[PDB]
Amino acid sequence: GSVIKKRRKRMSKKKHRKLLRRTRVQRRKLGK
Amino acid sequence: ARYTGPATRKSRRLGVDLVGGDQSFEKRPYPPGQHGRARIKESEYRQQLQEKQKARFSYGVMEKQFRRYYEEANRQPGKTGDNLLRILESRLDNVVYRAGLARTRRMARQLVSHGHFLVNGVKVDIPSYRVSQYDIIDVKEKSLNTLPFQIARETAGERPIPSWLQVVGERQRILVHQLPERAQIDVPLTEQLIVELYSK
Amino acid sequence: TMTDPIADFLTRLRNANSAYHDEVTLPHSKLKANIAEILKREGYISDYRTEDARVGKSLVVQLKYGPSRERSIAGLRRVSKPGLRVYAKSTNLPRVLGGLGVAIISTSSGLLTDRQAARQGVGGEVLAYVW
Amino acid sequence: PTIQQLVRKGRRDKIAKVKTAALKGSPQRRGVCTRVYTTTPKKPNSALRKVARVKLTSQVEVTAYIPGEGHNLQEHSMVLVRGGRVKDLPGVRYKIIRGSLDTQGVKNRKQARSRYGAKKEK
Amino acid sequence: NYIERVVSINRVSKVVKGGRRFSFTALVIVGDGKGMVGVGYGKAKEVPAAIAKGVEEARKNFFRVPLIGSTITHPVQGEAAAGVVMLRPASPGTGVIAGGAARAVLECAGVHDILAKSLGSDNAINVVHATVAALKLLQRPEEVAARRGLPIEDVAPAGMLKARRESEALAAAAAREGSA
RNA sequence: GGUGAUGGCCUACCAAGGCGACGACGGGUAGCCGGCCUGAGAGGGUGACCGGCCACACUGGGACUGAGAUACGGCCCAGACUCC
RNA sequence: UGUAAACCUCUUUCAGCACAGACGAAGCGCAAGUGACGGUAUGUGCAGAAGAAGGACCGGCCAACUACGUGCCAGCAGCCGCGGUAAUACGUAGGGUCCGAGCGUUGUCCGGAAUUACUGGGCGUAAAGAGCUCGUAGGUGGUUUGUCGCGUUGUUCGUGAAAACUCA
RNA sequence: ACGCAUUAAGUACCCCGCCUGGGGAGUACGGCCGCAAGGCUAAAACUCAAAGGAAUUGACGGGGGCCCGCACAAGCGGCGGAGC
């Protein structure tokens, strides 16, 4: 169908993975 | 309760003249209000509601009671419409009206409620009394000589009598052969749109 | 794989009746033959032959159409499927098409319509509706 | 799906969202107006819509509309809160009803007096 | 005396260089009130002309409805584009009870007693087409028995034939006051 | 042994089994039903009156008496609360 | 507005005033009486319309429409949304409508919702085929003979308390 | 609807997986796997009255094709600079 539906998920995923790359070491110090 | 307001205007809103004797509607045709002669959107709901209200205000029955009558008709067998009409005609105000003792269902209601009648010996102050097969509706001893029943016996040739009913005495005793069928009812109304209404 | 030759038979019938075929050959089963007999008696088909194949036996249903190719059948519907077997008591038998149809019922009195089953006071497995 | 899929997993109706949770099953609640104020509605509408943050008896602080022309409400006022959606105000689902022992009726209502706590004058 | 019944009026908009160029669509059912009914969809710049075109299309594509009395022969579920309308016959006096589209087509056909229900695609046009498809799927017992190659008795139920004979009497014997 | 009575109900010993994806063990919620409300029905929701069963009687535990006891308006203990 | 009203006539239900006055009790008592309800219900008479009607709604769903005032304010609204000086959507008047000693609102449940679809849905693009296979449990099972009669079906018995629901 | 159309998206049967408005979010918490990256399972609050699918008519395109116009190109004369 349309690619807007792809683009919404795209932006969500992009921002989430940026957040993870940003909090990688914090998340490690907390989890591990 | 009951509707003690003007009578002609309901008939005017509903087109059919239930009693008659006015010139406003009868020269200019319109429902009541300043916005008579207005533009109408011709909805089936208005049709149905108008037949229901025709019945309600032709008789003296209110909606919370007419609903019960409808439900009785729908439960009990046969056609719901003619069962409902049979019920509405098999009540004391209506039988004495149809017998011509009052020439108005309002007047018949006042008479029964004031106790100018009785049924099989026992006094009845209930217009909603559902009469039955083989019912003698006597008038009491004060009432037969009172003026309204004098007027009844005097002018008991104006409107016809149903078949299921007959008056038998100069004292205006009334007898019920059976309960009326849709041919016996003789009312200016259908009966299908009302059941459609309450099936909505 | 194949899981109900009854539905296979009804489908061969339905598809051939849609395509206006005059014959329907299919494998044989005593149950399918009895069903075909019911359809013949109720007038939904012209005839049915039981013949021999290379290996076993075949049913050849000679279907029926009017003069203007009016389909003698308007529908077939398996009901007691594998996975969901439906059984009818003699009281709550189904009226197919308001009664103008025919429900095939398997009972210990044999294979017989809903009408016959209500007559005989019995019920059983509802195989098909064949209006 | 298949019948066996159903007997295994079954049908689960979508969970209806509990609404007016601040009432906690009640039709109304009593609450102190913690902050009476005014809010601006959504974009198509514009007005100064009267509201109050009320701390109910359910231990919940909610926003509540104040229908009618006038209102005498200050903080610390005992108020009776019903339900009712106000579309233009996004974050509000409750209304205040007159005859709350503080919220007197609206002045000079004469058509729909029951909905605004107005007594008949005769 | 053809009874006519509009169910829906809709302002449709073509778009052009200048702007929105409007027109009107009228869905008009018409019938004889006794079993013949037709549907029309009139498209025209003005509402009355649209209705007139709908009337003409309906009277062109009339079709006859099987009945046993003032109801239908058997239940039937008609499907359209996406309109799904079940029809179920009903005992007399219960009244045609249906949404305005199915209701209109049935009241124009003369079906005063019937159960009907739209199960998909609330759009009135496809609903009407679905209802019509149902009425076309209907099968009178006479033509059914012909289709089978049997009597009417052993294909149709005694209740249907009882009501059939009753309606036939109330038609013919009660047409005396009309014929004389 | 115990019970009115069968039974790990309890005990000594013996054997090592038993339950679990067909959801054990846990967590949450809840008295159950006839019925009630809705609904075309299937179903959904509910468990007010009325009627039946259960459970409880400040909390927890315990027995005694007795044909019969969760013994509300009985007993013992402990605890909280109130009072002399 | 509005046969509405005024005015003529009638009627007295109900309420009020006076008198009587229970059934409930083949009961209890072998004592002479015994009814809490109760001097109640109810019957008799008495006077006169005499003491007795509000509430919601009127843009569509949803019958029922105008005027005035306010014009993105005040406000309304369940959704669509209405108010940006000519508002049938706000407020008030009239008028109409729906009910009627009720009327509306809120809350809760079902319906409508075939919107968890057994009856009764679907999955190419609308949400929906696991990335594909193997295979366990499970589900399912070609033709045919016989048997069991578990399912199934028929019949009968018992039970399915009463009340409820339904029919009379 | 586009389209599928004996390689079905048809007619039917069996079995499995999956959906139940859009966002939030295939995210958090928990757990499992993994060296890690991250994956798998998988919400809620809150929020919107839509999100969406196909197709139609137009408009538009730093899409295409064909054709026009002092539109460009080829020329002539100017304005913009001075004064009025």
UniProtKB/Swiss-Prot annotation, chain B:
<protein>
    <recommendedName>
        <fullName>Small ribosomal subunit protein uS4</fullName>
    </recommendedName>
</protein>
<dbReference type="GO" id="GO:0042274">
    <property type="term" value="P:ribosomal small subunit biogenesis"/>
</dbReference>
<dbReference type="InterPro" id="IPR001912">
    <property type="entry name" value="Ribosomal_uS4_N"/>
</dbReference>
<dbReference type="InterPro" id="IPR022801">
    <property type="entry name" value="Ribosomal_uS4"/>
</dbReference>
<dbReference type="InterPro" id="IPR002942">
    <property type="entry name" value="S4_RNA-bd"/>
</dbReference>
<feature type="region of interest" description="Disordered">
    <location>
        <begin position="1"/>
        <end position="41"/>
    </location>
</feature>
<dbReference type="GO" id="GO:0006412">
    <property type="term" value="P:translation"/>
</dbReference>
<dbReference type="InterPro" id="IPR005709">
    <property type="entry name" value="Ribosomal_uS4_bac-type"/>
</dbReference>
<keyword id="KW-0699">rRNA-binding</keyword>
<comment type="subunit">
    <text>Part of the 30S ribosomal subunit. Contacts protein S5. The interaction surface between S4 and S5 is involved in control of translational fidelity.</text>
</comment>
<dbReference type="Pfam" id="PF00163">
    <property type="entry name" value="Ribosomal_S4"/>
</dbReference>
<keyword id="KW-0687">Ribonucleoprotein</keyword>
Swiss-Prot record, chain C:
<dbReference type="GO" id="GO:0006412">
    <property type="term" value="P:translation"/>
</dbReference>
<dbReference type="GO" id="GO:0019843">
    <property type="term" value="F:rRNA binding"/>
</dbReference>
<comment type="subunit">
    <text>Part of the 30S ribosomal subunit. Contacts proteins S5 and S12.</text>
</comment>
<comment type="function">
    <text>One of the primary rRNA binding proteins, it binds directly to 16S rRNA central domain where it helps coordinate assembly of the platform of the 30S subunit.</text>
</comment>
<keyword id="KW-0687">Ribonucleoprotein</keyword>
<dbReference type="InterPro" id="IPR047863">
    <property type="entry name" value="Ribosomal_uS8_CS"/>
</dbReference>
<keyword id="KW-0699">rRNA-binding</keyword>
<dbReference type="InterPro" id="IPR000630">
    <property type="entry name" value="Ribosomal_uS8"/>
</dbReference>
<protein>
    <recommendedName>
        <fullName>Small ribosomal subunit protein uS8</fullName>
    </recommendedName>
</protein>
<dbReference type="GO" id="GO:1990904">
    <property type="term" value="C:ribonucleoprotein complex"/>
</dbReference>
<dbReference type="Pfam" id="PF00410">
    <property type="entry name" value="Ribosomal_S8"/>
</dbReference>
<comment type="similarity">
    <text>Belongs to the universal ribosomal protein uS8 family.</text>
</comment>
From Swiss-Prot, chain D:
<keyword id="KW-0820">tRNA-binding</keyword>
<dbReference type="GO" id="GO:0019843">
    <property type="term" value="F:rRNA binding"/>
</dbReference>
<comment type="function">
    <text>With S4 and S5 plays an important role in translational accuracy.</text>
</comment>
<protein>
    <recommendedName>
        <fullName>Small ribosomal subunit protein uS12</fullName>
    </recommendedName>
</protein>
<keyword id="KW-0694">RNA-binding</keyword>
<comment type="function">
    <text>Interacts with and stabilizes bases of the 16S rRNA that are involved in tRNA selection in the A site and with the mRNA backbone. Located at the interface of the 30S and 50S subunits, it traverses the body of the 30S subunit contacting proteins on the other side and probably holding the rRNA structure together. The combined cluster of proteins S8, S12 and S17 appears to hold together the shoulder and platform of the 30S subunit.</text>
</comment>
<feature type="compositionally biased region" description="Basic residues">
    <location>
        <begin position="107"/>
        <end position="117"/>
    </location>
</feature>
<dbReference type="GO" id="GO:0006412">
    <property type="term" value="P:translation"/>
</dbReference>
<dbReference type="Pfam" id="PF00164">
    <property type="entry name" value="Ribosom_S12_S23"/>
</dbReference>
<dbReference type="InterPro" id="IPR012340">
    <property type="entry name" value="NA-bd_OB-fold"/>
</dbReference>
<keyword id="KW-0689">Ribosomal protein</keyword>
<dbReference type="GO" id="GO:0015935">
    <property type="term" value="C:small ribosomal subunit"/>
</dbReference>
Swiss-Prot record, chain E:
<dbReference type="GO" id="GO:0019843">
    <property type="term" value="F:rRNA binding"/>
</dbReference>
<keyword id="KW-0687">Ribonucleoprotein</keyword>
<feature type="domain" description="S5 DRBM">
    <location>
        <begin position="2"/>
        <end position="65"/>
    </location>
</feature>
<keyword id="KW-0689">Ribosomal protein</keyword>
<comment type="function">
    <text>With S4 and S12 plays an important role in translational accuracy.</text>
</comment>
<dbReference type="GO" id="GO:0003735">
    <property type="term" value="F:structural constituent of ribosome"/>
</dbReference>
<dbReference type="GO" id="GO:0006412">
    <property type="term" value="P:translation"/>
</dbReference>
<comment type="similarity">
    <text>Belongs to the universal ribosomal protein uS5 family.</text>
</comment>
<comment type="subunit">
    <text>Part of the 30S ribosomal subunit. Contacts proteins S4 and S8.</text>
</comment>
<protein>
    <recommendedName>
        <fullName>Small ribosomal subunit protein uS5</fullName>
    </recommendedName>
</protein>
<comment type="function">
    <text>Located at the back of the 30S subunit body where it stabilizes the conformation of the head with respect to the body.</text>
</comment>
<keyword id="KW-0694">RNA-binding</keyword>
